[PDB]
Amino acid sequence: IYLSRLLIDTGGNPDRPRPGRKWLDNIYNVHRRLSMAFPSGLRREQDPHFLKPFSPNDFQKTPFLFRVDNNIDGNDKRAIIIVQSVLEPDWDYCFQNALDFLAAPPETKEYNPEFKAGQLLRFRLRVNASVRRHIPEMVQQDGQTIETGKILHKRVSLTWDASSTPDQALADWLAAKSPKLGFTLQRCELLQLGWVYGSKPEPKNVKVKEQGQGYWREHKYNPLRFRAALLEGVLEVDDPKLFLKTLSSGIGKAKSFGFGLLSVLPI
Amino acid sequence: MLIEIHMIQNHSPANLNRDDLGAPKTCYFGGVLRSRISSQCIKRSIRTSNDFKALLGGVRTRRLADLIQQEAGETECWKKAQEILNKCGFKNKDDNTKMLVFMSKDKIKDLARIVLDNSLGLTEAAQQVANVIAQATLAPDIALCGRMLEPNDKDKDKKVKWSNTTVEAALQVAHAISTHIARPEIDYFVAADDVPGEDAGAGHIGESMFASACFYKYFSIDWEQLVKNLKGDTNLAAHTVGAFLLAAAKTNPSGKQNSFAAHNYPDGILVEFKNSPISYANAFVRPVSVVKESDLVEQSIGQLSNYVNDIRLGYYDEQSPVIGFWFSPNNRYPLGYKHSKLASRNIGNLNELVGAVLDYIGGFKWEEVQKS
Amino acid sequence: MLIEIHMIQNHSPANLNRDDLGAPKTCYFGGVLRSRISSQCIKRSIRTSNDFKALLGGVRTRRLADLIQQEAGETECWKKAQEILNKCGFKNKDDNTKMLVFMSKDKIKDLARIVLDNSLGLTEAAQQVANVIAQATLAPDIALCGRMLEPNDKDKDKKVKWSNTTVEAALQVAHAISTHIARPEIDYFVAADDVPGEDAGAGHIGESMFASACFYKYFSIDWEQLVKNLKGDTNLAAHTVGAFLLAAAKTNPSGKQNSFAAHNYPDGILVEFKNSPISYANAFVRPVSVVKESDLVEQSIGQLSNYVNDIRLGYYDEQSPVIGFWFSPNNRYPLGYKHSKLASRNIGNLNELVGAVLDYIGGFKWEEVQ
Amino acid sequence: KYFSIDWEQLVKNLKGDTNLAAHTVGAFLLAAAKTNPSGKQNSFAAHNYPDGIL
């Protein structure tokens, strides 16, 4: 598989238009752009310069994993995007009209990861602290109303006991499912605990005009909220046929919006 | 007249301050990139600290309706009875979910009292609430942080009067800057091309737990403004000063609260009693470069000592020659810098230092006053 | 003889002077962007400072009738006096009077007499008020600064009588500029709610700006024309020079100091005495890049010493001698230029240099002039 | 900045008084390198000196 690197300028003059920095405001925009970085054959031949209208059905729907972190390069702040996929990405076709998005040209390296039993890898990982509660619908109404009755099962953020710590709680949450994916954690240090926001358009059929031919479509924007937890540590390995499938896929839900990427450095 | 405080601390990357993109905050000081913790992060972490739990008077709430709802206990806790603030004058649509109010938490009973009576209706209740809002400033962290709450631009004309709601701050906190250049994090794109080795460098070094970062912090409490903010009650202001100092010594800005580790204690405090605020942040314009992190704090104290000696005998006037105190774990050469001209009392205990500060201010002691 | 003060200061991230939107004030010098503090901001910071509180005897009041009824009592005399102020040339603008008046702090009491002159009101009251406004200038700050006070037109067309209210100057202050390329920043602030249950997920982040820089300030006091504005009071002029030195050395603008707290002190002051004003701001036409061995302040002092020596051996005259001091705390930063010492007397203390300047001026000391 | 002075025309303007013409040229060259316009200098004090004169 391949790992790709994108560098975005975070500092610079703050009184100028910075479309590369503004692109990281919406994570759906990031996912859509990385999807546009995967042309589907005849799209390149029909549109080499990427000027015809964008169509999701004209691009491949292969999954990929990416992580957006931040760093300092000498005396400048930078945002690094690490893209892990299974097919060779084409960053030339994606940003060819948006060369000002990236401060530095993209990079790509072939990854051939395999580790037999006895490797103490150093890992970094940003998970989505999500859980499906059995009773997540109390219907806490607002205003004058405070308590009405309905029940449904929904995904919400992970919660911890008031007498415990978030670090230990997330450590045992990761260790509880850990033998299924094939690793043992020695140290688990919590580095961040926050949210990830985004917006998504959805077509809506307002009334048909004179021969509207399938209603009049109007965009309506719906929000997207995720609870993110970034953590590093040291982990061993066992059953490498399971760890390779763990590396190929992600960990936790919402894998298509920056979560689940496991970064491992051999030691 | 000032309780000027200069601190040198350490903070692991788990405990830091971040921005909208998740990056740690930075700044340029002396032309080089540094690490920064914002003042509002340090200011709030004192309020939410366990040491300041004793006083902790005040809520900065966008939703005053939900806060007053459990104090009212009646159907009248909403509708236009709790949209009364719009007739009082709020920027409801020019600001996202009204405007924040720095209201004292032990004053919601008065707001419940006014909202629970509807005999007078909204008339004369949309304006008598303004007096209670303006008078809700008797609070320790309201006195320290200071509020500014202002009326709106369009809804403050419906027979609406407002007094001076703004209270002057009695505490100034600087953006805590590091004493060295910002260390880059570990690259992870290099794992596909090479390996650091078998538990070797650029990798499994250990380095205790992580790579810390020295930080220089600066506080400036003015005693007169703090006393006049609380309308007398000099012992309560002394309790607030002692609690704030104890909180600022051993509080991490982010989560992961310490239980008892003794590494959260700062390695140096410089409590000074000037009448004009002086910052020693210019000690670290020259970056403190080193390979070994054990003596990094030691040479940081050395640079601070050199600069404080230079300033205190260069800008010295005979009218108010004042001296201060100093704390360290008797480790980083506390006896041997600047020949103890400023040091006077050298202290290795937190509570003893607080007692000394309270003795110099008014003659009190920390263990005596803990109540109103 | 002209007294010149050149300062070099370094500031922690502060946002001292702000634009109308909220950004720090910048400028261009040498083709690069620099952080800038305006002259009027520096003058107002010195004017209302602590060390200058003894000589403060003037008000820039925009609501002079409020001050009139604020001393003599009888607040109803506002609607006796304000319209009178509307007749002297204040146009009865949007505020009480949009024409800011600069006037000595004592003569307001004299205007109180105009309050009690109900028999001699109307035109006589307005003319007498104009006489007091025109003849109220003997103040150590109004003499230091200027006063234009050109009354707005559409006044009374009968007997609008005005003297020469213009008082020229005694002090020139240049816009303080950094010696390097400025790097402005944004402090992304958010307003955390206290009660859980906000139920708002969106972009609620904010943008507040700041910057850090090493500034070069340049003052200039004309020794004559300050005594002339002070009507021959040489001791008051000497006290004004000394206290101005004190305040300019130990005061910073009070802009967002409650959140940035950048009370930094200057690391070098150069005081010169010469017959023509020279500004050494052209030293930093080239931006001061920082090397690893030194810091910003040392390189700034080095380039300033280079330019000062080149000016000294350049535009040099035989009839006009130049004598200069050089201040640095405990000689931490000498006027670094190889083995060449430029100033005639290095000084390591502030009050010592104030006394040295004062006794050069003609025999004044920091004890009896106050 | 650019200045041009005609020597013969100045001498003819000064009734052939070469003592006044040389003094005028010298004091002009001195005053042109040490004087700046007075417009807005009490708030923008920019008393700079020339870096090169030909």
**What residues of chain A lie within 8 A of the CB of B13, using their CB?**
191
What is the C-alpha to C-alpha distance for residues B355 and B342, in angstroms, rounded to an integer?
18
Which residues 23-52 on chain D approach chain C with CB closer than 8 angstroms? Answer: 33-34, 41-49, 51
C-alpha span between B267 and B245 (Å, rounded) = 14
* Cα C71 from Cα C67, distance rounded (Å): 7
Residue B270: name the closest of B169, B370, B356 by CA: B356
Q: Which chains have at least 3 CB atom pairs separated by less than 8 Å from chain D?
A: C
C193/B contact by beta carbon, under 8 A: yes
Specify which residues C7 forms β-bridges with. Answer: C217, C269
Sorted by sequence, the CB contacts under 8 Å of residue C87 that are 6+ apart come out as C126, C155, C156
Contacts for A112 with CB less than 8 Å, ≥ 6 apart: B192
Residue whose tokens read 């250049």: B181
Q: Give the contacts of B131 (CB within 8 A, at least 6 positions apart).
A: B163
In a mutagenesis test of the C interface, which of D49, D51, D53 is the best target, namely the one with the most C β-carbons within 10 Å? D49
Please provide residue B180's backbone torsions phi and psi, each rounded to the nearest 5 degrees. Answer: -145, 175
Q: What is the Cα A188 distance to its own chain's centre?
A: 21
C290 CB within 8 Å of a chain B CB: yes
Calpha distance B133→B111 (Å, rounded) = 9
**Interchain contact D/A (3 or more Cβ pairs less than 8 Å):** no
Nearest to C296 among B30, B146, B313 (CB): B30
How far is CA C43 from each of CA B283, C174, C250, C353, D18, rounded to the nearest angstrom? Answer: 28, 10, 13, 22, 50
The minimal CB distance from C260 to the residues B29, B39, B318 is found for B39
Tokens matching residue C314: 């350049």
Count Cα atoms within 13 angstroms, Cβ side, for A211. 0
Are residues A116 and A238 in contact, defined by beta-carbon separation less than 8 angstroms?
no
Write down the experimental method used for this entry: cryo-EM
Cα–Cα dist C20/C29, whole Å: 22
The C-alpha atoms of residue B267 and residue B327 are separated, in whole angstroms, by: 7
Nearest CA in chain A to B200: A267
Contact C336, C8 (CB under 8 A): no
- Best D40, D42, D44, D48 member to test C by mutation, with max C CBs in 10 Å, is D42
> Residue B346: helix, strand or coil by DSSP?
strand
Buried b (16+ CB within 10 A) or exposed e, B10-28: bbbbbbbbebbbbbbbbbb
Report whether B134 contacts B162 (CB < 8 A).
yes
Nearest CB to C257: which of B59, B172, B313?
B172
What φ, ψ does residue A70 adopt, rounded to 5°?
A: -135, 155
Helix or strand holding residue A83 (H, E)? strand A76-85
Handedness of CA C272, C274, C280, C281 (dihedral sign): positive
Taking CA atoms, A170 is separated from A229, A258, B255, in Å, by 9, 19, 14
Q: Are A109 and B192 in contact (CB under 8 A)?
A: yes
- Shortest CA distance from A107: residue in chain B: B189
Interface test with C, best of B62, B96, B149 (most C CBs within 10 A): B62
Rounded-to-integer distance, Cα A81 and Cα A68, Å: 5
Q: Give the residue from B16, B20, B21 with the most A CB atoms within 10 Å of its CB, the best one to mutate.
A: B21
Q: Which of C23, C186, C201 sits opposite A197 (nearest CB)?
A: C201
Tokens of A177: 């499912």
CA–CA separation, D49 and D54 (whole Å): 14
Q: Give chain C positions within 8 Å (CB) of A140.
A: 197
Q: Which residues of B touch A167 (CB under 8 A)?
A: 256
Structural resolution in Å? 3.1
CB of A76 within 8 Å of any CB in chain C? no
Q: What is the DSSP letter of A225?
A: E
Q: Is the CB of residue C209 less than 8 Å from the CB of residue C185?
A: yes
